[PDB]
Each structure stands twice: as structure tokens, then as C-alpha cells.
UniProtKB/Swiss-Prot annotation, chain A:
Co-factor note (free text): Binds 1 heme c group covalently per subunit. PSII binds multiple chlorophylls, carotenoids and specific lipids.
Entry superkingdom: Bacteria
GO molecular function, one term: heme binding
Designated name of the protein: Photosystem II extrinsic protein V
Binding sites annotated in the UniProt record for heme c: 37, 40-41, 92
Intracellular or extracellular location(s): Cellular thylakoid membrane
Keywords: Electron transport, Heme, Iron, Membrane, Metal-binding, Photosynthesis, Photosystem II, Signal, Thylakoid, Transport
Oligomer status and interactors: PSII is composed of 1 copy each of membrane proteins PsbA, PsbB, PsbC, PsbD, PsbE, PsbF, PsbH, PsbI, PsbJ, PsbK, PsbL, PsbM, PsbT, PsbX, PsbY, PsbZ, Psb30/Ycf12, peripheral proteins PsbO, CyanoQ (PsbQ), PsbU, PsbV and a large number of cofactors. It forms dimeric complexes.
Cystine residue pairs: none
Swiss-Prot record, chain C:
GO cellular component: extrinsic component of membrane; photosystem II oxygen evolving complex; plasma membrane-derived thylakoid membrane
Record key words, sorted: Electron transport, Membrane, Photosynthesis, Photosystem II, Thylakoid, Transport
Keyword Transport belongs to the record: yes
One Pfam family matching this protein: PsbU
Protein name, per record: Photosystem II extrinsic protein U
Topological type in the membrane: Peripheral membrane protein
Lineage: superkingdom: Bacteria
Species annotation: Thermostichus vulcanus
Gene designation: psbU
Biological process, per Gene Ontology: photosynthesis; photosystem II stabilization
Disulfide bridge map: none
InterPro entries named among the record's database cross-references: PSII_PsbU
Record family assignment: Belongs to the PsbU family.
From Swiss-Prot, chain D:
GO MF annotation: an example: oxygen evolving activity
Cellular localization per UniProt: Cellular thylakoid membrane
Protein name: Photosystem II extrinsic protein O
Pfam families in alphabetical order: MSP (PF01716)
The family this protein is said to belong to: Belongs to the PsbO family.
Subunit organization: PSII is composed of 1 copy each of membrane proteins PsbA, PsbB, PsbC, PsbD, PsbE, PsbF, PsbH, PsbI, PsbJ, PsbK, PsbL, PsbM, PsbT, PsbX, PsbY, PsbZ, Psb30/Ycf12, peripheral proteins PsbO, CyanoQ (PsbQ), PsbU, PsbV and a large number of cofactors. It forms dimeric complexes.
Organism annotation: Thermostichus vulcanus
Source taxonomy: Bacteria, Bacillati, Cyanobacteriota, Cyanophyceae, Thermostichales
UniProtKB/Swiss-Prot annotation, chain E:
Role according to the record: One of the components of the core complex of photosystem II (PSII). It binds chlorophyll and helps catalyze the primary light-induced photochemical processes of PSII. PSII is a light-driven water:plastoquinone oxidoreductase, using light energy to abstract electrons from H(2)O, generating O(2) and a proton gradient subsequently used for ATP formation.
Range of the intact protein held here: 283 to 338 of 505
Cell location: Cellular thylakoid membrane
Protein name stated in the entry: Photosystem II CP47 reaction center protein
Gene coding for it: psbB
Superkingdom of origin organism: Bacteria
Subunit structure and binding partners: PSII is composed of 1 copy each of membrane proteins PsbA, PsbB, PsbC, PsbD, PsbE, PsbF, PsbH, PsbI, PsbJ, PsbK, PsbL, PsbM, PsbT, PsbX, PsbY, PsbZ, Psb30/Ycf12, peripheral proteins PsbO, CyanoQ (PsbQ), PsbU, PsbV and a large number of cofactors. It forms dimeric complexes.
Family: Belongs to the PsbB/PsbC family. PsbB subfamily.
Length: 137, 56, 97, 245, 56
């Protein structure tokens, strides 16, 4: 098995558009995810709220939808609760809250895309392991 | 089938460290000389006598 | 006659749908728009005689009422089960991942 | 008094005691029945736990007997709040809403038997006599409360059996006949009622603070249906601050 | 056992008849309590002492 261009092709928006990430993009997203996110989201779960994971199916049912690049990038700028009802930048890392979450300062649009790409590609590789927790280790 | 208990009781040992008495009282404090303290005293005595035997 | 009441309840609609009177709050993550805001209002205002009674929670916005209507089909009500609602278990039932 | 800080209190045992009022507080706190009220803090400090002995006959006067607390200074109920309604007959009814309204407690009977109980006033509704135009040292509250299972539904026994989790059989005895073990294998969740009296001994009419003695009756732990509970009588002191809501 | 049952079904037996034609002796070998690798070093005595005396 390989990390093919097909594996690296993910939804850009809600409207059927896709983007094909490069191998470099994927690997940078992984590095950045580790750097900025994995302290809470290691392996696709969420340590400070295990009820919400990063599985693609879970992301698809968030409001607004988060199962695409643009939705994830918006989340990293202006995070909300799962119903979209409250903005949570004060307690979740975001560009809007990079003052209080300093590992978000100087993330570029490309960096956010790369992280988003990681989040969508990883379950395509790992299956249920992504967002599965210890059951699937 | 109690054989030594009644001897302890005849002479005034009626309580346990656990809080009961053979008259059916509760929350009683027998001091050291409960049934248990008498038993421990006998065991310690036994030991001391054993050691004195060795010396003699 | 000795019965495990949780196992018994799995044979009711509690085993098939979100029971507004019993089910732990995380279940509301299954469908779009229910968690956390509506989820909290539902659990706080339980129990309900019928699923449609969820529409009457004081203070719901017009949008919230629409969202509840879209999801009535995924809800049920059964009798309150003490074992499922004590301990604050509807807010945290000891299951994480 | 020199208003105590956490560092003044920590480790002294004072944290498990209810506030007290001194001897000057034999006043009357006026009740204006157009006004709504609240209890801002209700505190219950148990000083004795009595357990009803389970005699052979049946019928005889079975007495409540003294016990020794083995779980240390962890017994008090506090930070309890709720509505204080003024009823049409001039009685008051306290409806408990929230607070630290339970404590697990283990007391030991003479001979060693340990009696765990969920000492509680969960969902207390307690009322005065009619015509309480002022709360005085004649006032009292009587009411009832809920007493849920001492262990909640996830609790697993030493062989891993539970109600909401766990095995449903005795797995170490794979070919044992199941009928004899049903009471142990099938966990049950108790919910019973208790009764409490609050006797007001002291009232500060300026501040709305009251204190007194209480006696509560409730069942002990039944170990998720494995054995019969015991009846328990809890006696102690209480404190409450009343405020217009 | 499955082979015998299938041969019976294929000869027109009902399911009741097919399974009723299996000898109890054959069925009892297909039970793990007769497996010699299910015991214990200090679990003493006959197999009957654990699961019981098989009746039917
Ligand atoms: C090869 C020898 C052998 C074997 C395979 C058997 C097999 C059997 N016997 Mg028989 N039997 C034997 C010899 C044997 N027997 C002898 C010599 C006698 C006379 C004592 C008997 C008397 C006997 C009776 C009376 C009964 C049996 C029964 C049985 C059955 C149950 C066995 C059981 O529970 O074991 C249990 C085995 C153990 C608990 C293992 C013991 C391990 C030892 C104690 C270890 C010692 C360690 C050592 C001290 C360490 C030293 C350290 C040092 C060097 C530093 C089984 C079919 C039972 C039965 O069902 O009969 C119908 C029964 O009632 N047998
Ligand atoms: C001279 C006299 C010798 C003195 C004997 C001293 C007795 C103590 C030693 C016996 C201890 C073992 C008995 C276990 C307990 C017991 O009660 O058994 C009791 C069992 C019988 O078991 C009984 O059976 C009954 C129905 O008949 C019921 O089912 C009872 O419930 C059941 O306990 O006794 C035996 O089975 C005896 C035979 C054991 C076979 C041993 C296999 C080989 C072991 C090899 C060891 C090699 C070690 C090398 C180490 C170096
Ligand atoms: C712990 C302090 C966290 C870190 C670091 C990051 N996230 Fe997070 N994330 C966290 C929580 C507690 C939650 C749930 C928030 C809520 O109340 O709704 C989240 C949620 C997300 C989501 C939404 C997932 C969903 O299914 O809808 C996403 C997409 C997400 N987080 C992404 C993300 C990224 C990319 C991070 C690094 C830049 C990151 N999170 C950090 C807690 C924490
Ligand atoms: C008074 C009193 C009493 C009593 C008392 C008594 C009874 C006592 C006893 C005592 C005793 C009874 C003592 C004893 C002692 C002993 C000893 C002291 C010993 C010693 C020994 C030795 C020293 C030894 C050595 C050796 C050895 C060991 C070995 C070999 C070698 C040799 C020999 C070297 C009472 C309690 C009632 C009460 C209170 C008071
Ligand atoms: C004042 C506030 C309002 C008070 C509200 C408190 C009342 C509780 C809600 C009433 C619910 C009706 O009562 C409930 O009915 C449903 C539907 O028949 C039953 O659940 C049922 O579900 C399924 C349907 O797939 C059946 O397979 C099952 O045999 C059956 O038990 C519950 O076992 C019962 O507990
Ligand atoms: C072997 C160690 C001895 C332990 C001693 C514990 C003393 S305990 C002591 O015993 C007295 C004597 O009757 C009583 O009067 C008193 O009430 C009791 O507390
Ligand atoms: C060998 C050392 C062990 C000795 C222990 C002596 C216990 S001392 C004993 O303790 C009881 C409390 O249970 C009291 O009722 C009793 O008054 C006291 O003397
Ligand atoms: C030297 C004696 C030391 C051992 C004393 C053991 C504690 S004393 C013991 O306590 C049990 C539990 O309360 C009681 O049931 C029993 O009646 C009593 O004898
Ligand atoms: Ca009084
Ligand atoms: Cl899930």
C-alpha cells in the first residue's frame, strides 16, 4: 500500500469540490497537528472532551459542516461548539485566540490547509483507529 | 461450647475491645482487661515463662 | 422476580432511539444541531409525556423548535429509570472513549 | 470573630462543622408573605449515628444503638440552597434545589459489623407549622427526602458484576447453577424515602440566620440488592441563612 | 455431528428428527467440560466434582 494521490484527495468545500494534497503538504500538516493539536487530539480523539472526536463522520454532522478543508480552516480561525451556537476561541486554539494560544501565531493559510488535510487523510489510512481511542491501539 | 469465657466473666471480665459485653450492653469500654487483653496477657506470660525456663 | 432494569430497558425504545427521559447527554451528538445547547435544555427539562412535549421547553428559539421537529423521529420517551438518572449520570455516565 | 480563611481552617476539623450562633440569638425573623424567600445555605452536621438492632423476636422493642464512625470528618451536608415558600396557611416550605446534600458514611456496631449509609437530604421538602409570621425558637421544619442507592449503577462488585456495567454471572463458577446466585448476580437499585425534623434553637432576627438540632431517619446501604438495609437515625446540629429572594 | 445432521436433512428428516438422531454420547464429546485442557492443578478429583454428573 502507498500514500497515493487518491488517498490524498479530500473535499475542499461542501459543494463537491476536492483538492489533491501533495505528500509534502500531508507531512507538514502532520507535523503541525503534532506541534499545535496533539496534546489534546492525539490519534483523533479529544482528551479534554472525549465526547467529540475528529472522525470524518463526526465532522460532517458538525454545524457548520467541518468535513472539508474550508470548514476545518474556518474552525482553526473561529472555533464553535458542535451546534455552531457559541464561539469558543477563548478556550480553544485558533488564529483569533493566538494571543492566548501562542502556538497559533504565524500559522499561515497554507499551514491551516495542511493541518485540515491531515485531519481528513488520517482516517482514510487508519480507519477506526482515528478517533477510536485505546480500544483500537 | 464456651469453656474459658465463663471463668473470665465470673471474676469481672465481661467486655470486648470490639464494644460488646456478655450482658448484652453496647458501646462499652472495658479498658485493657477485656477478654482480648486477658488472652494477650496470658500469651505474653507464656513467652516470659518460656524464656525463664531456658535460663534455669 | 429479579431483573436487571438496564438490560430490560434495552428491549424498549430506549434501545432504539434517544430517550429524552433517560439517555445520557452525549447521545445528542449523533445528529446535527442538538449538542450542546439543545442537549442541555432537554436533559434539564425532562421528563416528557411524549416526544413532542420537547417542543414546549421554556425559552426555546424559533430555530431550535425547527431543529427539534426535524429530530423527533430519532427520539423516544420511556418511564424514568432511577438507575440511569441518579448520580448525575445523564451528564456523565463514566464512559469516555 | 476573626473571619477564618482556608489556611486558618485547613486540617483542624472545622471544615466539617456547621456555623453556630451564640446565646444572644433568641430573636424572631419576620416573614413578609408578599415577599419570596430562599435558604442561601443549609448545613447539617451529624453528631451521632444510631442503627436499629435487628432482634430475633419479632415482636419485641428493637432499639437504636450507638455506633462508631470510622470514615472521619467527612460526614456533613452543606452549601445546600433552595426556595423557601410562604404558604396560604402561613407555614413555610423549604424546597431543596442543590448543594452538597449527601455523604457516604460508615459506622461500626459493637462486634465489628460495618454499616455504610448514604447520609442525605436529597430533594428535601420540609415545612413548618401554620402561621409562622416570624421564625423563632418555636419554629420547626419536618419533611421527607429521597435516598438513592449508596452505590450508583456503574459500581462493580469484587467479581466484576454490576447493573449498568459488568458481568451478569459468576464467571469463576462457570457450571454452577445460577438460581442460588441470582440475588448476587442481578444488581438492583434502591430508592427509598427518609424523614427529618429540624428544631430551631437559635435565631438572629437581624441577619436571618437560624440554628438548631436535627434528627433524620433513613435506610442504610443494601449493596445493590444483595442484603437488607438497616434503619438509621442521625442526630446533629444545623445552620441555615434565610434571605429574601 | 453437522455431517450426520446434514445427511439426515438431505434424506428428508425434519430438523427435530435430524438432531434427535444424534447420539447423546457423540454430543457429549462436543462439550468443553470433557476437554482435558480445562482443569487446574489443585482442582482435585473426578470431572463430576466440577460441572456435575451429566444426566442428559
Ligand atoms: C501417576 C500417578 C497418578 C495419577 C496420574 C493419578 C490420577 C488420578 N487419581 Mg490417583 N493415586 C495415585 C497416583 C496417581 N493418580 C497414588 C500414588 C495414590 C495413593 C496416594 C492415588 C490415590 C488416589 C485417590 C484416593 C483418588 C485419586 C484420584 C485420581 C484422579 C484425581 C487426581 C487429582 O485430583 O490429583 C490432584 C493432584 C495434585 C493436587 C498435585 C499434587 C502436587 C504435589 C503435592 C507436589 C509436591 C511438591 C513437593 C512437595 C516439592 C518438593 C520441593 C523440594 C525438592 C525442594 C486422577 C484420575 C481421585 C479420584 O477421583 O478417584 C476416583 C481420588 O479420590 N487417586
Ligand atoms: C507415608 C504417607 C504419605 C503421607 C501423605 C502426605 C499427604 C500430603 C501430600 C498430599 C497433597 C496432595 C493432595 C492434594 C489435596 C488433596 O486432597 O487430594 C485429594 C485427591 C482426591 O480428590 C478428591 O476426590 C474426591 C472423590 O474421590 C472428591 O471429588 C474430593 O472433592 C476431591 O478433593 O487425592 C488424589 O487425587 C491423590 C492422587 C494425586 C495424583 C498426583 C499426580 C502426580 C503428581 C506429581 C507431583 C510431582 C511433584 C514433583 C515435585 C518435586
Ligand atoms: C486541548 C486544550 C485542545 C487543543 C490543544 C486543541 N483542541 Fe480541538 N478541541 C478541543 C475540545 C475540548 C474540543 C471540543 C470543543 C467543543 O466544546 O465543541 C475540540 C474540538 C475540535 C474540533 C471539532 C471536532 C468536531 O467533531 O466537531 C476540531 C476540528 C478541532 N478541535 C481541531 C483542532 C485543531 C486543528 C487543533 C490544533 C490547531 C486543536 N483542535 C487543538 C480541545 C483542544
Ligand atoms: C505486677 C503486676 C502484674 C503481674 C505481673 C507478672 C505476672 C509478672 C511476670 C513476670 C515474669 C514472668 C517475668 C519473666 C522474666 C524472664 C526473663 C527476664 C528471662 C530471661 C531469659 C534469659 C536472659 C535467657 C537467656 C538464654 C536463652 C534465651 C537461650 C539459652 C541461652 C540463655 C540461657 C543465655 C499484673 C499484670 C497482674 C497487674 C499489674 C501489676
Ligand atoms: C409532568 C412532567 C411530565 C411527566 C413525564 C413522565 C412520564 C414518563 C413518559 C411516558 C412514556 C410512556 O411509557 C413508555 O412507553 C414506551 C412505548 O410504549 C415503552 O417502550 C416500549 O418501546 C418499544 C418500541 O420499539 C417496545 O419494543 C417495548 O416492548 C416497550 O417497553 C416504555 O417501556 C414505557 O416506559
Ligand atoms: C500490651 C500493651 C498494653 C496496651 C495498654 C492500653 C491501655 S488502655 C487503658 O487500660 C486501663 C487499665 O484498666 C483502663 O483503666 C483505661 O480505661 C484504658 O484506656
Ligand atoms: C500487642 C499490641 C496490641 C494491643 C492493643 C491494645 C488495645 S487497647 C484498648 O483499645 C480499645 C479500642 O478498641 C478500648 O476499648 C480499650 O479501652 C483499650 O485499652
Ligand atoms: C491479642 C488479641 C488481638 C486481636 C484482637 C482482635 C480484635 S477484638 C475482636 O474484634 C472483632 C471485630 O470487631 C469482634 O467480632 C470480636 O468479638 C472481638 O474479639
Ligand atoms: Ca426550639
Ligand atoms: Cl462515537
Amino acid at each position: 500500500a502507498e500514500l497515493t494521490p487518491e488517498v490524498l484527495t479530500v473535499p475542499l468545500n461542501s459543494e463537491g469540490k476536492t483538492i489533491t494534497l501533495t505528500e509534502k503538504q500531508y507531512l507538514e500538516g502532520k507535523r503541525l497537528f503534532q506541534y499545535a493539536c496533539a496534546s489534546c487530539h492525539v490519534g483523533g480523539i479529544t482528551k479534554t472532551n472525549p465526547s467529540l472526536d475528529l472522525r470524518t463522520e463526526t465532522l460532517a454532522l458538525a454545524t457548520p459542516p467541518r468535513d472539508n478543508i474550508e470548514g476545518l480552516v474556518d474552525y482553526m480561525k473561529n472555533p464553535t461548539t458542535y451546534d455552531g451556537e457559541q464561539e469558543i476561541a477563548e478556550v480553544h486554539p485558533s488564529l483569533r485566540s493566538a494571543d492566548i494560544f501562542p502556538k497559533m501565531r504565524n500559522l499561515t493559510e497554507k499551514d491551516l490547509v495542511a493541518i485540515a488535510g491531515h485531519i481528513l487523510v488520517e482516517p482514510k489510512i487508519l480507519g477506526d483507529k482515528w478517533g477510536g481511542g485505546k480500544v483500537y491501539y | 461450647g464456651m469453656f474459658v469465657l465463663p471463668f473470665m466473666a465470673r471474676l469481672g471480665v465481661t467486655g470486648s475491645w470490639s464494644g460488646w459485653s456478655i450482658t448484652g450492653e453496647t458501646g462499652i469500654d472495658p479498658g485493657f482487661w477485656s477478654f482480648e487483653g486477658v488472652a494477650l496477657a496470658h500469651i505474653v506470660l507464656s513467652g516470659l515463662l518460656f524464656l525463664a525456663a531456658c535460663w534455669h | 422476580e429479579l431483573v436487571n432494569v438496564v438490560d430490560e430497558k434495552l428491549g424498549t425504545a430506549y434501545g432504539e432511539k434517544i430517550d429524552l427521559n433517560n439517555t445520557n447527554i452525549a447521545a445528542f451528538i449523533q445528529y446535527r444541531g442538538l449538542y450542546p445547547t439543545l442537549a442541555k435544555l432537554i436533559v434539564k427539562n425532562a421528563p416528557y409525556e411524549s416526544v413532542e412535549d420537547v417542543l414546549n421547553i421554556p425559552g426555546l428559539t424559533e430555530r431550535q423548535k425547527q431543529i427539534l421537529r426535524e429530530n423527533l423521529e430519532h427520539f423516544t420517551v420511556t418511564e424514568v429509570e432511577t438507575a440511569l438518572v441518579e448520580g448525575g449520570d445523564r451528564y456523565n455516565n463514566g464512559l469516555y472513549k | 470573630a476573626a473571619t477564618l480563611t482556608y489556611d486558618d481552617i485547613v486540617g483542624t476539623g472545622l471544615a466539617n462543622k456547621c456555623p453556630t450562633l451564640d446565646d444572644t440569638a433568641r430573636g424572631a425573623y419576620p416573614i413578609d408573605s408578599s415577599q419570596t424567600y430562599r435558604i442561601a445555605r443549609l448545613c447539617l452536621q451529624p453528631t451521632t449515628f444510631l442503627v436499629k438492632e435487628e432482634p430475633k423476636n419479632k415482636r419485641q422493642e428493637a432499639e437504636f444503638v450507638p455506633t462508631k464512625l470510622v470514615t472521619r470528618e467527612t460526614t456533613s451536608l452543606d452549601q445546600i440552597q433552595g426556595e423557601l415558600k410562604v404558604n396560604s396557611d402561613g407555614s413555610l416550605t423549604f424546597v431543596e434545589e442543590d448543594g452538597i446534600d449527601f455523604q457516604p458514611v460508615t459506622v461500626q456496631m459493637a462486634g465489628g459489623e460495618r454499616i455504610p449509609l448514604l447520609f442525605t437530604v436529597k430533594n428535601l421538602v420540609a415545612s413548618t407549622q401554620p402561621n409562622v409570621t416570624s421564625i423563632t425558637t418555636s419554629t420547626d421544619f419536618k419533611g421527607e427526602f429521597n435516598v438513592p442507592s449508596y452505590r450508583t449503577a456503574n459500581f462493580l462488585d469484587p467479581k466484576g458484576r454490576g447493573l449498568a456495567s459488568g458481568y451478569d454471572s459468576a464467571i469463576a463458577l462457570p457450571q454452577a447453577k445460577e438460581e442460588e446466585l441470582a440475588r448476587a448476580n442481578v444488581k438492583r437499585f434502591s430508592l427509598t424515602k427518609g424523614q427529618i425534623s429540624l428544631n430551631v434553637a437559635k435565631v438572629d432576627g437581624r441577619t436571618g440566620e437560624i440554628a438548631g438540632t436535627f434528627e433524620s431517619e433513613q435506610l442504610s446501604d443494601d449493596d445493590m440488592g444483595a442484603h437488607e438495609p438497616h434503619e438509621v437515625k442521625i442526630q446533629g446540629v444545623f445552620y441555615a441563612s434565610i434571605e429574601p429572594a | 455431528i453437522n455431517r450426520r445432521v446434514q445427511a439426515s436433512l438431505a434424506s428428508g428428516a425434519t430438523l427435530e428428527e435430524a438432531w434427535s438422531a444424534i447420539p447423546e454420547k457423540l454430543a457429549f464429546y462436543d462439550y468443553i467440560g470433557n476437554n482435558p485442557a480445562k482443569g487446574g492443578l489443585f482442582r482435585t478429583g473426578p470431572m463430576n466434582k466440577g460441572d456435575g454428573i451429566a444426566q442428559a
